[PDB]
């Protein structure tokens, strides 16, 4: 079939690699592996090394903090492709087999496995102004030559391919998500009730999300308005643990309800990036070049995963708010409200191939 | 008279020394328009204030210190000495800002560079200039008109309210203590997230700063209480030592600003190929 | 699964007409739209494209700016006010959906509509 | 640029039960980003193969095709009467998405 190749500026170091993506099963990932070809005449005595690096930028290199860098590594691995590691004999994949068959004798394989609990390749919306190597997590594979591992990385004789690791929707749909609450106040004993639910548990990007809500206004008060929202809780792990929260989409409704009455309705709304350009810090599902990706898909974390190592984690929650009037013998436009949240999942199905920034 | 030939040589020596590098960084924001950032413009606001001290203040004070008296007159100590405080207070007021980005970035890296803008950054700069001036310039000028005659003469240029222990007890700590208080805690708290040059630079910027303005602000408690036991032989010691602030401080951060430190001194394509069938 | 299309007919040169088509069972935010020309007895000619989930549109270089495509999410419909007719536009026009994620060809086609420029 | 396509041949007469090939070359390299569609007279066309290899779900596997350099090509394994129609190739790697001159299947 087709495979991806790329040769170093020195024209003599080329890498061959089948799939750019590497799907991530809940506890398994496609082993990332390829074959590198070089003109031995050039290689007087140097050794050829290929390295996988999982970097994580969190501050643009132009940042002003003295000394403190902004590029943490999560996992790197090195392999001396040539000399072809006699003691290290690997079970060459059939892909490497066929590649070897095609190219000459001067090609040599390389094969990295991946730690299971690692983040999907995501990048944070770089906003209008800044440029360069964008933020977020990233996976690269370099190939170069040197006699010493710590020696300088002479640019013209090395080549690197970016790589993305992604996940697809769990084939078995989960339990239908929902929640409910009640609120009472110093006025009387009649806590109004509020239940909310979702059509299903997993949604594909653009699948219209439908909230179903019911409310029983027992108390002698009036709900002024309703505000439904879909928010992107994006946890960032570092030396510290911080969490951001960006409202990805929303809607509101002036469906007032009288005291002691009741009401119910289904609303709907769709998360989508189009109208969410300007919001910096938003998380995107990773890019190779500046290809406009889609709203970063929720990380289907394995239950009880050791999220401490996980650089970035993403999750999407819908949230319903009922704002009411506290007026009366003591009250005005200023008043309190109720809110309830339902987490869910937003991912892709399991297709047979991905688009390399086309159309 | 050889010490006179030696000590007076230090006068001209430290006079223009800090004045020279002051304009250097002050122009790199305009000349080196590529090595210049708003987060680095704050460091330029330092030299913006750190210049006048070594130009007008650190120069004229040497005259009164050498002559033994300040024949320039009280009308001269009216605005001149007003500048020294209003300037030095403004410098530290800015250095407070220079200790928040260093926190905001290192603590919450994502909100900060988006939360600010050059239109809002300028107000974050000039307010430090105005606030420190308005806190000192009129009070130093009103101290006479509020109390009457000038409590100090021009044979030893001194403070107008030098004995008014009312504000001089409070104006010192407020303008000094809380700044140095939050600062040393932050840059340790910032070090908590940290690593060779950084720990070698954190205290470096810190301990240098406190070596400058602490003895003045500390001894400022003595004059308000023990005015006669403050020796004039030492009144210029700290005054000249604290004058060294606007000299080493601009030299303190060029060590880290590698981009300005230089300013003041090829890709093939990803492609595919055919793989044969089984 | 179906997809209706209408809003066409006979128009005069330079004129305008908002040919539209609706997608029964397609959240527009997951299925880009395109329109494509067939000159009667000639090869198909792509015309325009809209991708709601990015707001991007792309028009035919031949008539770039001459027409204007758009969409209506409230009804899951797509609009195209063809304007300023250059006479090379008299043809049949189809509107079709991709998968706005992971383009895999024009998997579904409305019945199109014949739109010709004449006097 | 505006990549052009060349559907060769431009017409074809053939017989029932025959296995037949039709090619089209691209003015550049579009890297297998091509789809083959069918269209009968009057009716609206339908996709047949996307990515130049994968047959669409809902087609008889007698259709096939592959890519060699800038030249892709499809084949039918046995021309049923339902298969006598016009066939288009169309790349999509480079906006805008041009088709080819196409190809029309006639009776022997
Ligand atoms: C700034 C300042 C103050 Cl605030 C000050 O206040 C202290 C005080 O109240 N007294 C009362 C009367 N005498 C006992 C003298 C000291 N005394 C001085 S003496 C000097 C200097 O040495 N100037 C240089 C020109 C010689 C100062 N800069 C200075």
- CATH assignment of B10-257, given 2.60.120.560, 3.40.50.2300, 1.20.1070.10, 3.30.160.250? 1.20.1070.10
Total structural domains in chain C? 1
A200 labeled binding residue: no
Sheet holding A222-237, edge to edge: A202-204, A337-347, A312-325, A222-237, A241-253
> What was the structure determination method?
cryo-EM
Q: Which residues in chain A are contacts of B40 at CB distance < 8 A? A: 64
Q: Are B42 and B125 in contact (CB under 8 A)?
A: yes
Task: Answer yes or no: do A133 and A21 share one domain.
Answer: yes
The length of chain A is: 359
Helix axes B74-97, B196-226, angle to 10 degrees: 140
Q: Which residues pair with C37 in a beta bridge?
A: C45, C93
Resolution (A): 4.0
Task: Answer yes or no: do A273 and A337 share one domain.
Answer: yes
- DSSP assignment letter at A290: S
Interface contact A343, partner B, CB < 8 A: no
The answer to whether chain B touches chain C by having 3 or more C-beta pairs less than 8 angstroms apart is no
**Does residue A127 sit within a domain?**
yes
Domain map (residue ranges) of chain D = 1-108
Structure tokens at A180: 């409910």
Q: Are A37 and A16 in contact (CB under 8 A)?
A: yes
Closest Cβ–Cβ partner in B102, B110, B113 for A244: B110
A250 labeled binding residue: yes
**Does residue A34 sit within a domain?**
yes
Helix axes B196-226, B245-253, angle to 10 degrees: 160
As a three-state string, the secondary structure of chain B is: CHHHHHHHHHHHHHHHHHHHHHHHHHHHCCCCCCCCCHHHHHHHHHHHHHHHHHHHHHHHHHHHHHHCCCCCCHHHHHHHHHHHHHHHHHHHHHHHHCCCHHHHHHHCCCCHHHHCCHHHHHHHHHHHHHHHHHHHHHHHHHHHHHHCCCCCCCCCCCCCCCCCHHHHHHHHHHHHHHHHHHHHHHHHHHHHHCCHHHHHHHHHHHHHHHHHHHHHHHHHHHHHHHHHHCCHHHHHHHHHHHHCHHHHHHHHHCCCCHHHHHHHCCCCCCEEEECCCC
Task: Answer yes or no: do A145 and A198 share one domain.
Answer: no
Backbone angles phi, psi at D88, to 5 degrees: -120, 140
Task: Answer yes or no: do A338 and A248 share one domain.
Answer: yes
Domain that holds residue A260: 175-351
- DSSP assignment letter at C116: E
Quick one: which atom of ligand 1 is closest to the CA of B69? 25
Q: How far apart are CA B112 and CA B103, in angstroms?
A: 10
Q: How far apart are CA B81 and CA B78, in angstroms?
A: 6
DSSP C10-31: EE-TT-EEEEEEEETT--GGGS
Say how many CA atoms lie within 13 Å of A119 toward its Cβ.
Answer: 33
R_g over Cα of chain A = 26
Residue A125 CB neighbours (<10 A): 23
R_g over Cα of chain D = 13
Task: Answer yes or no: do A138 and A156 share one domain.
Answer: yes
The length of chain B is: 278
- DSSP assignment letter at A115: -
B158 in ligand 1 pocket by Cβ < 6 Å?
yes
Domain end marker among A157, A172, A187: A172
Q: Which residues pair with D14 in a beta bridge?
A: D107
Domain that holds residue C94: 1-119
Q: Are A216 and A249 in contact (CB under 8 A)?
A: no
Give the β-pairing of C113-117 and C10-11. Answer: parallel
Are D92 and A359 within 8 A, CB to CB? yes
Q: Are A324 and A263 in contact (CB under 8 A)?
A: no
**Does residue A284 sit within a domain?**
yes
Q: Quickly tell me which residue has 């122009």 as its tokens.
A: B27
Q: How far apart are CA B105 and CA A84, in angstroms?
A: 45
A350 labeled binding residue: no
- DSSP assignment letter at A164: B
Task: Answer yes or no: do A151 and A203 share one domain.
Answer: no
Quick one: which atom of ligand 1 is closest to the CA of B155? 25
Closest CA to B221 of B173, B179, B151: B173
Closest Cβ–Cβ partner in B107, B113, B256 for A67: B256
Interface contact B110, partner A, CB < 8 A: yes
Residue A295 CB neighbours (<10 A): 23
Interface contact C58, partner A, CB < 8 A: no
Q: How far apart are CA A111 and CA A34, in angstroms?
A: 7
């Amino acid at each position: 079939t087709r495979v991806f190749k790329k040769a170093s500026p020195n024209g003599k170091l080329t890498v061959y690699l089948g799939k750019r993506d590497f799907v991530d099963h809940i506890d398994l990932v496609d082993p990332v592996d390829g074959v590198v070809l070089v003109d031995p005449e050039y290689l007087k005595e140097r050794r050829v090394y290929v390295t996988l690096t999982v970097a994580f930028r969190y501050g643009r290199e132009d940042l002003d903090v003295l000394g403190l860098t902004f590029r943490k590594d999560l996992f790197v691995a090195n392999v001396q492709s040539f000399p072809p590691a006699p003691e290290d004999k690997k079970p060459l994949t059939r892909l490497q087999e066929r590649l070897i068959k095609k190219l000459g004798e001067h090609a040599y394989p390389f094969t990295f496995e991946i730690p299971p609990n690692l983040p999907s390749s995501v990048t944070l919306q770089p906003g209008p102004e800044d440029t360069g190597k964008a933020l977020g997590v990233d996976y690269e594979v370099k190939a170069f030559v040197a006699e010493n591992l710590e020696e300088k990385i002479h640019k013209r004789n090395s080549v690197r391919l970016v790589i993305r690791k992604v996940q697809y929707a769990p084939e078995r749909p989960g339990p239908q998500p929902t929640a409910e609450t009640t609120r009472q106040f110093l006025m009387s004993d009649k806590p109004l009730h509020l239940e909310a639910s979702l059509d299903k548990e997993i949604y594909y990007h653009g699948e219209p999300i439908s909230v179903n809500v019911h409310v029983t206004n027992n108390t002698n008060k009036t709900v002024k308005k309703i505000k439904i929202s879909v928010r992107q809780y994006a946890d960032i792990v570092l030396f510290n643990t911080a969490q951001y929260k960006v409202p990805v989409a929303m809607e509101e409704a002036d469906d007032t309800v009288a005291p002691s009455s009741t009401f119910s309705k289904v609303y709907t709304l769709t998360p989508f990036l189009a109208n969410n350009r300007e919001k910096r810090g938003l998380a995107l599902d990773g890019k190779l070049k500046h290809e406009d990706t889609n709203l970063a898909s929720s990380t289907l974390l394995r239950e009880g995963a050791n999220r401490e190592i996980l650089g970035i984690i993403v999750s999407y929650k819908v949230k319903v708010k009922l704002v009411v009037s506290r007026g009366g013998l003591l009250g005005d436009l200023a008043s309190s409200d109720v809110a309830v949240e339902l987490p869910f999942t937003l991912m892709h199905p399991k297709p047979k191939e991905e688009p390399p920034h086309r159309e | 008279t050889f010490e006179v030939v030696f000590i007076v040589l230090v006068a001209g020596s430290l006079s223009l020394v800090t004045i020279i590098g002051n304009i250097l960084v002050m122009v790199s924001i305009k000349v080196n328009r590529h090595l210049q950032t708003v987060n680095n413009y704050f460091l330029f606001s330092l030299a913006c204030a750190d210049l006048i001290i070594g130009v007008f203040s650190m120069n004229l004070y040497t005259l009164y210190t050498v002559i033994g008296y300040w024949p320039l007159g009280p009308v001269v100590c009216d605005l001149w000495l007003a500048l020294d405080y209003v300037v030095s207070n403004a410098s530290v007021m800015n250095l407070l800002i220079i200790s928040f980005d260093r926190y905001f970035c290192v603590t919450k890296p994502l909100t900060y560079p988006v939360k600010r803008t050059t239109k809002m950054a300028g107000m974050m700069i000039a307010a430090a200039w105005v606030l420190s001036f308005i806190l000192w310039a009129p009070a130093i000028l009103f101290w006479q008109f509020i109390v009457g005659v000038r409590t100090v003469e021009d044979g030893e240029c001194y403070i107008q309210f030098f004995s008014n222990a009312a504000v001089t007890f409070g104006t010192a700590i407020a303008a000094f203590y809380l700044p140095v208080i939050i600062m040393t805690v932050l840059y340790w708290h910032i070090s908590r997230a940290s690593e060779k040059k950084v720990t070698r630079t954190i205290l470096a910027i810190l301990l240098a700063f406190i070596i400058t303005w602490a003895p003045y602000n500390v001894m400022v408690l003595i004059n308000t209480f023990c005015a006669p036991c403050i020796p004039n032989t030492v009144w210029t010691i700290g005054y000249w030592l604290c004058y060294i602030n606007s000299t080493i401080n601009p030299a303190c951060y060029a060590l880290c600003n590698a981009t300005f430190k230089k300013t003041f001194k090829e890709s093939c394509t990803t492609a595919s190929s055919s793989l044969a069938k089984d | 699964v179906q997809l209706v299309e209408s809003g066409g007919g006979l128009v005069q040169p330079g004129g305008s007409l908002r040919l539209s088509c609706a997608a029964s069972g397609f959240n527009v935010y997951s299925s880009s739209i395109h329109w494509v020309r067939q000159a009667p007895g000639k090869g198909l000619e792509w015309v325009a494209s809209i991708s709601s989930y990015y707001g991007y549109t792309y028009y035919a270089d031949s008539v770039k700016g001459r027409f204007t495509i758009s969409a209506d999410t409230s009804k899951n419909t797509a609009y195209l006010q063809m304007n300023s007719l250059r006479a090379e536009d008299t043809a049949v026009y189809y509107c079709a959906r991709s998968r706005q994620f992971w383009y895999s060809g024009l998997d579904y086609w409305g019945q199109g509509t014949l739109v010709t420029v004449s006097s | 640029s505006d990549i052009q396509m060349t559907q060769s041949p431009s017409s074809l007469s053939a017989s029932v039960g025959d296995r037949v090939t039709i090619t089209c070359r691209a003015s550049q390299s579009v890297s297998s980003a091509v789809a083959w569609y069918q269209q009968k007279p009057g009716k609206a066309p339908k996709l047949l193969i996307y990515s130049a290899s994968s047959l669409y779900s809902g087609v008889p596997s007698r259709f096939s095709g592959s890519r060699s350099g800038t030249d892709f090509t499809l084949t039918i394994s046995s021309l049923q009467p339902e298969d006598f129609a016009t066939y288009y190739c169309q790349q999509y790697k480079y906006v805008p998405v041009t088709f080819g001159q196409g190809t029309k299947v006639e009776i022997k």
